Amino acid sequence: MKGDKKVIQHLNKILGNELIAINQYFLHSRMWNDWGLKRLGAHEYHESIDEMKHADKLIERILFLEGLPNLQDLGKLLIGENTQEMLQCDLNLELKATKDLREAIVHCEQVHDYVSRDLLKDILESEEEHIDYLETQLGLIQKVGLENYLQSHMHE
Amino acid sequence: MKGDKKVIQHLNKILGNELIAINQYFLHSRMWNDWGLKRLGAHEYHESIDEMKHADKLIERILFLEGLPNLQDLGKLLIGENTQEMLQCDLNLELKATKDLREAIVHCEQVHDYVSRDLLKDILESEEEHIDYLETQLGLIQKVGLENYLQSHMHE
């Protein structure tokens, strides 16, 4: 079904953000596992899987709309050097992602691609849940202290 | 069965205390969940449910006695800004509630409404258990420190 060219560009932009997040979250997960912070590693792994599933759905929608999904261009990963930075890098990436999602929904609405809009709204709900998680982790580091926060994430 | 006018007024005052407690505990629960302190959130949620069940029983007794349950007037909620204040706000509310329960029981006894007295005694037992929980949490904060106390309440 021939899609709107600019819808497809927006979907490829969202997909590109998901592709960054897959790799960024997967590396952060394995860094935390390597450091013995296995509960953080496990949760970050599941965040990475979630982005993989979003990327899948975007690829499928783009192809149905007779566009070419862009898996070639990989933007800049934000890799932290400690737990606090890794969580902040994730949150900064999510805030860009949700900004881009909102602009994509605007355009979908304007050209009446309501199914693409519904897909993006669902992805936006997942990303806002991830923002909730990240903001809460940063708040907990303040409320329980870094040593306790890391201690609470050693064992699964 | 027509009840004593002043019993019904006492029952409505106790009900009013329960209605404040429902909302105060429900908001505190959701604040704690938002902050990532999910074990505190779950326990405060169950305290809110407790008060909902007491309010139900009070409403049922008032109606049986052919009075009008007052769900319209809501007294002042005591909302804290941090964990220790939220617990102390709960405790201050509970101490007012048990004072009001005692005066209501005196009057039920004087006019021989022994069934209303028994209901209020059951509610008073529950409220004294809540006071025990609150005093104990405040004592634990002193013994283990706030950061450890909150750490122990991150995960359900």
Next chain:
Amino acid sequence: MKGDKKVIQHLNKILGNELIAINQYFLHSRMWNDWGLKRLGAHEYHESIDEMKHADKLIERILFLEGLPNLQDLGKLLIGENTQEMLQCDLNLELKATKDLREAIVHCEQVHDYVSRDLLKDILESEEEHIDYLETQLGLIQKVGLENYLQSHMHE
């Protein structure tokens, strides 16, 4: 995540309507149980519970958006004195509620808070189901007559 100030005001207004509905439906439920109309009592109880669930989700969203949920201000309860009037009071409240939901959705769309819109849309679907139920009950009273209508609601 910092929310739009007027979105949060709209959410608190929707929350206020739900808080009214919780108490109005809970009291109507217990009135119907006291009168021996237990099927009405049980159905109205479940309506109250549904409103409690909506209020929970609104509270949770407001906190995520870094607003202050308002559980203190309680608007006017519409309490009926007989079955037809109670249903009509519920219906009047619901029509006020869906008017407010539509205006809140308009504003969420305008500021691109698509997740808040989706939450409100889900709530609007529930409230329109309640309107469907209420309009149908009032119509049944006209079709089968009040005495038969009440008879049919004595037993669950």
Next chain:
Amino acid sequence: MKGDKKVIQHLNKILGNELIAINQYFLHSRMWNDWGLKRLGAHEYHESIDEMKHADKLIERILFLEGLPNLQDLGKLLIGENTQEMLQCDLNLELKATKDLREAIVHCEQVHDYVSRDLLKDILESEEEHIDYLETQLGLIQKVGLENYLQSHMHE
């Protein structure tokens, strides 16, 4: 297998009657559900389903006989405005349907299409069962009164 031309015309006529009945019974069903008369709504829904199944077999038989099933022409639906009228409308349609079935059976018998006759006899048995049901409901309205009759069809 090449069928008799007039058998196919008769089969298309019976099918045309079933297609009217499908839509008339389905709309009456949903009207009754909208009005809270859910036992009538459910029963009328099953009548519509039964006509769908008859239409299926008629379509299958026409095609085996190398005819063209006519799903394009839709005759006049008889939609009532209240329960008595709706039941009488169904009954008027069923009486036309059974007249047409009898004439189709005569013709199948004359050209020795005994399998088509057997199919139509089975459909006629179902339509006479529907007639019994309809006549009985109209009779019950007279015996128990309209208000009781409707009351008895509120709950499934």
Next chain:
Amino acid sequence: MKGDKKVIQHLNKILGNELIAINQYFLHSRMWNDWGLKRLGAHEYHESIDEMKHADKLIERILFLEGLPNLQDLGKLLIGENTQEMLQCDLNLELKATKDLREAIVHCEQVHDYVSRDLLKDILESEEEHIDYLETQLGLIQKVGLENYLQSHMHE
């Protein structure tokens, strides 16, 4: 609940499209079964049932909105004479349907009937999945050849 007159007209227009599709897909299904292409027949049958379910929900929504569902007017069925043409007829009908769904959604949005919009969006998702299925079948015919395509749809 009194709905917008033009929303109801749009809903009846969508319903009219579903009613055409029910009959067109059902006949196509039974043609394919008669020709021994049972996997096509079964899939097309399930497409017809899906349109029946959409029509039900549209009828129910119209009645809730106090309009009159139109099951009387049946538009033009597009019946093919061979497998390729039947698939193209279905696809042509689906493209008209999704064009009409988009216009109805625009109008629901403008009058703030967000629940009708959500229903139509769900139907639109279903119809776009049908378009994907249809476009894919036509493409497979080109890739594997017509004889192989039919061969693969002989047995379920």
Next chain:
Amino acid sequence: MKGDKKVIQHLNKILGNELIAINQYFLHSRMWNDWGLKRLGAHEYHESIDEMKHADKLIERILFLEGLPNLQDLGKLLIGENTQEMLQCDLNLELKATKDLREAIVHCEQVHDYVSRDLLKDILESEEEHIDYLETQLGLIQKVGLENYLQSHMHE
């Protein structure tokens, strides 16, 4: 445990090849699904998953050896435009991957990193199995013909 610098460089090169393959195979999988060639789509999905698992193990080994896994640099994806070309693109990528694997094993052996060698040997076994599959598919296209080969991969 501090690893050999050039081993880590080799591991990152193997990792880089796996990251290309993940995306290349995932996109090919979703293209085949879009085209209705669901058995190829499923098999190619499992190949993509297999490469994801290899990438995970390389990332973990690199971090253990105190290197920085490179998920940022993504080399050139080889995306075909039809089935035969997609298989060949997978095959060309795999032939480069196994050459690089052999060179990495040589160097691991030279510096006595026998665990890294064993990991690379296991990955090489998986890549050679993938080569067996790909060569066999390309040969089957020749033996049964393209139209039959595609037909045989339509349904899972």
Next chain:
Amino acid sequence: MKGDKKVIQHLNKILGNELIAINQYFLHSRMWNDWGLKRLGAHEYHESIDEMKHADKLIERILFLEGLPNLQDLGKLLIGENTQEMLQCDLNLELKATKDLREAIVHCEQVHDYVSRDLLKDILESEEEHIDYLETQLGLIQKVGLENYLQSHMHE
């Protein structure tokens, strides 16, 4: 089967390293248990058991190759006096063990004793996993502090 004299000497040297580790890890395990650090005790016990299993396989291989396993000469145990020292003593022993394993693998390769090489590679994989565990624990002590690290290892 007569083995290479120097392979057997290498195998007896690896065996000697394993025998030290059995006793060192078993004593550390029981010290931690006596101190109430039962999770460290349990983990260290399983490390000791693992070395016992390695020693068993080495003894079996030496006898198959017609050498004499040396269980008489026991090298120097590295027993720490506190948790940090005990972990570092384990790590120092493992680093010596993996150096000796690498030299033995070199010699097995030169004389084509590929089965002995495979046995040693498997032991080396297990010892590098122990190195990973030990390095991670020492890092966790720095990240969460010694008191939290010990607290997390009180209960199994």
